[PDB]
Design a protein around this nucleic acid. Structure first.
Lengths: 79, 101, 78, 83
RNA sequence: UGAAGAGUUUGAUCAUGGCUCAGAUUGAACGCUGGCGGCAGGCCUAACACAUGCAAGUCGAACGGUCCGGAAGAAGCUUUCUUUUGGACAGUGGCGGACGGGUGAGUAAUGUCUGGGAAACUGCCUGAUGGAGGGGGAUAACUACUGGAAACGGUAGCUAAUACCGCAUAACGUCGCAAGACCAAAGAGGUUUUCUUGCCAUCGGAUGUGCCCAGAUGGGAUUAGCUAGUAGGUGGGGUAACGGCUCACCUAGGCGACGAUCCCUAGCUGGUCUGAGAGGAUGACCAGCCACACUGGAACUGAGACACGGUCCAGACUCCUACGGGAGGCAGCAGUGGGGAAUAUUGCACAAUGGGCGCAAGCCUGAUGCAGCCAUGCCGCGUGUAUGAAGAAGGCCUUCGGGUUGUAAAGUACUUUCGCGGGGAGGAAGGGAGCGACGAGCUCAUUGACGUUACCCGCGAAGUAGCACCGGCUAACUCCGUGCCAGCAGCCGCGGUAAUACGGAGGGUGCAAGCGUUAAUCGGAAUUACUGGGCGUAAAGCGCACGCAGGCGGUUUGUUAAGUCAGAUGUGAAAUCCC
């Protein structure tokens, strides 16, 4: 699966957390609600920096918290 | 009734008499009962005469006595020690009275 | 072990069996894999006492599906 | 039949595999020790007496497949290193 | 194809608003009453304590002895004794109790539900490939002796296999490098030179699972900052396997108002009841999953139980006891006592269906199929049918003229539930034998709980009914008694001498072996209003400003197209619901 998000942190090495956000209708009201999730994606090349809107795909579990890897960078920067 | 039970047994604490309210006047027979529910409430004693002592021990039905504020329950005659009304030729269903020969 | 036996829809004076293929673990009248036909002991409800659908069981048979002694008789009758 | 027989066999059963693993860790360490020392000849020769023994434990319900292969890989991985 | 409201806060009116009513349902109980049958259903209350019986074995086509049975011998007969053989038990040896059955205590968690992923595993059964050469070793039974009250135990001697072990071939597989080296395996039975059962290694099939992930899963913040292995990294240990899961070292993070942490509660679901729908409530019967067997903890053996009739330790209790020391644990079936408003035969039976083991014969199987008890519910049926006075008697009313209960009863004729006699069921083929090569196939013979019940035929007597209610909502009236006394009462109320609402009687209405009562669930409530609502005075704008997050955002063009929309396809278990 592919997920789009922002690089909210590049503190760790080879590890970048992507803040993916989505919009879903409320099961009762139906009005769209905002929901986000942080995913620790792998980045061996430490190519992606903070502010980068990258794509994320499911991959072989690098660690317990990391099960995703950086595929491609959408845009350059957006702080 | 606590456990939403239709009826609830209990032991009488005292079988005294009470007087109706403003519009009525009489000596209605009531009795404080310590139900197994853990509550000590007062119940009315239907019938023209009863045989409830101190260790009566009777079942409670549940019914408010308009004239006697506080009495929200009625005693079931024909059960346990509460003997059914004597010579009841009428509504024997209530007062628990076996049909005479 | 997958097996082809008779499922009893059987009601009071209305005994009907459904030759079906299902895991031997499952109950006699539980969730079955697939019905291959039916059996009417009295054959009163319908003239067609039994409908085996040979080709169907012909598949399960060889697939590892074993047929009970009673069912084998009905199936053998085709 | 005798429900006790199954109890006694199980106990003496562990006593068996218990000794087998002992021989394993005993020689595996010997090989590693030799390798660490540098003695090639004596080491490998001792390494060989550890392979079939761990392979034999696999023959029965002593060490089984996986864990048996693990040991073979780990041992040979520690000997070719320090050597 | 789907939606009626009414009563009551006024002297009267309108509005707001709360309460209340006729209906349906309940594995119910209680009161009065009670005939039969079919199907269904039954501790909904203490994991409180329990007398007694019962809850898995099966193989002599693995081996040596007793018990039960048959046959043939040595003998004139008897005693005694010998050989052969069937069953089985006792033992040795092999394979099976983690299935089925019960309960819901505990449990908010990938535990469960839905949709996916992979770092995995799988006896017996099925398909395919290859193989089974030589040798060695061990322990009971049994025999002898000793200890003990018993349980049971110690020592000495003999001994076998499809029991254990070492050596060969490499179909292959494993490990380093890259395109090298290493590692396997028991027979038995016969219609015995031919098959049958079984074994060893490998691949696959069938099925069942371990683990991980997205989303979803109750109440309270008078539960807010929390955390040190705590978050991550390297290496190692550990496991079938990922993982701080565990360890050493390093880094210092990780989580939180999209509510963590803490506290409370309840097995969950398919479904069930209700509702126009949404939704609410529930999850008891049956089916799936989960968690529990004296209380608590733990591990071993195994494909699987951390395992009710397996084991170990701690604790209480009960029983046995020559007190030295032992035996148990009905929240398994039935049942007992205690509890409660209340819930049943310590019954019959395996032939049928299904299950375990066996080549088979066959053995085991209170799983289940039935009967019993109880109007607890549902449906069917009977206590009669036709006739019978302008109109008995009796009771009741009366302007006593008469009217009413009434064709109602009596009586006449007819049929004739019970009961009796006879007959008597479906629900069930092989083993064996004959033909055939005791193979395929064909043919033939023997045998059943509920029941002697259902049902059929014959005979045949009129042959239980009650309960609630009659002021209004609610359909159905008078007389007498009593007299705010006694009593009634869901609400409004009624009774102080004329009461259809008190008690009795006559009559009447409703229903019918049923009828009432009590308790519990549903809408009406557009009274949280998404569909359906309001806030100047009836309840309701926060005192104001600034401002964070969040929510929302003008006109034109282009790209993407996530939301949104469309087609196709997979999934959406069964049953249920609808036709």
């Amino acid at each position: 699966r592919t997920l789009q998000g922002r690089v909210v942190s590049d503190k760790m090495e080879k590890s970048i957390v992507v803040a993916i956000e989505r919009f879903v209708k409320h099961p009762i009201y139906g009005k769209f609600i905002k929901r986000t999730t942080k995913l620790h994606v792998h980045d061996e090349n430490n190519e992606c920096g903070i502010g980068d809107v990258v794509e994320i795909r499911e991959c072989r579990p690098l660690s317990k918290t990391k099960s995703w890897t950086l595929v491609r960078v959408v845009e350059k920067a957006v702080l | 009734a606590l456990e939403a039970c239709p009826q609830k047994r209990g032991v009488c604490t005292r079988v005294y008499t009470t007087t109706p309210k403003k519009p009525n006047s009489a000596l209605r027979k009531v009795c404080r009962v310590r139900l197994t529910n853990g509550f000590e409430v007062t119940s009315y004693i239907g019938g023209e005469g009863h045989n409830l002592q101190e260790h009566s021990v009777i079942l409670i039905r549940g019914g408010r006595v308009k004239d006697l504020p506080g009495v929200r329950y009625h005693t079931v005659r024909g059960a346990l020690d509460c003997s059914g009304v004597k010579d009841r030729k009428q509504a024997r269903s209530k007062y628990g009275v076996k049909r005479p020969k | 072990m997958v097996t082809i036996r008779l499922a009893r829809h059987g009601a009071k004076k209305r005994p009907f069996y459904q030759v079906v293929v299902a895991d031997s673990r499952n109950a006699r009248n539980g969730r079955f894999i697939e019905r291959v036909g039916f059996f009417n002991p009295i054959a009163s409800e319908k003239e067609e006492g039994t409908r085996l659908d040979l080709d169907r069981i012909a598949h399960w048979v060889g697939q590892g599906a074993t047929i009970s002694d009673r069912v084998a008789a009905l199936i053998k009758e085709v | 039949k005798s429900a006790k027989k199954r109890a006694i066999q199980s106990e003496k059963a562990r006593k068996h595999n218990a000794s087998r693993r002992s021989m394993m860790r005993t020689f595996i360490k010997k090989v590693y020790a030799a390798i660490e020392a540098g003695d090639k000849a004596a080491a490998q020769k001792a390494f060989n007496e550890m392979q079939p023994i761990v392979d034999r434990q696999a023959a029965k319900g002593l060490i089984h497949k996986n864990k048996a292969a693990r040991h073979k890989a780990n041992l040979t991985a520690q000997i070719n290193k320090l050597a």
